[PDB]
């Protein structure tokens, strides 16, 4: 084994997820972009 290289892809793998996190956060929840979107309940209904 090259232990180096296997803890190198784990830490991309939870930069990618840090990455989901923050960019999600200013997609869905912003101020009430989760309950309403555009219509009230569903997102377009």
Partial sequence: ???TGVEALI???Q???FIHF???????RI???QQ???RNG????
Avoid at 22 to 28: L, M
Avoid at 42 to 45: R, T
């Fill in 31 to 33: 101020g009430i972009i």
């Fill in 15 to 17: 930069q990618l997820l």
């Fill in 11 to 13: 830490r991309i793998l």
């Fill in 36 to 38: 309403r979107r555009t």
């Fill in 22 to 28: 923050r960019i999600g956060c200013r997609h869905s």
């Fill in 42 to 45: 569903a997102s377009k209904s």
């Fill in 1 to 3: 084994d090259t232990w």
